[PDB]
């Protein structure tokens, strides 16, 4: 509808504010990968597990580069 597109406005804004936060801390995730991580964070998920798996998978795309 309209107010659910105004909710789409309040999510498109936050997805850019976190994109500023992502580059001043210079994480390797681009907007596409961060788009999977924000949906995960909505469901409730341990960042102490997720950061270990991201530091594992980034250690395997520079080992198979």
């Amino acid at each position: 509808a309209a107010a659910a597109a105004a909710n789409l406005n309040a999510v498109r804004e936050t997805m850019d504010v976190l994109l500023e936060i992502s580059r001043i801390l210079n994480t390797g995730l681009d907007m596409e990968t961060l788009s999977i991580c924000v949906r995960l964070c909505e469901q409730g998920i341990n960042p102490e597990a997720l950061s270990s798996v991201i530091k594992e998978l980034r250690k395997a795309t520079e080992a198979l580069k």
Binding site: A5, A6, N9, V11, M15, R39
Partner: peptide, 23 residues
């Protein structure tokens, strides 16, 4: 789903009669 729909479009005009991010 929400970031699929996130890439929607909006108009260039911004309202002088609505404040709070008018699209």
């Amino acid at each position: 789903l929400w970031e699929a729909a996130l890439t929607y479009e909006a108009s260039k005009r911004r309202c002088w009669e609505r404040v709070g991010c008018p699209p």
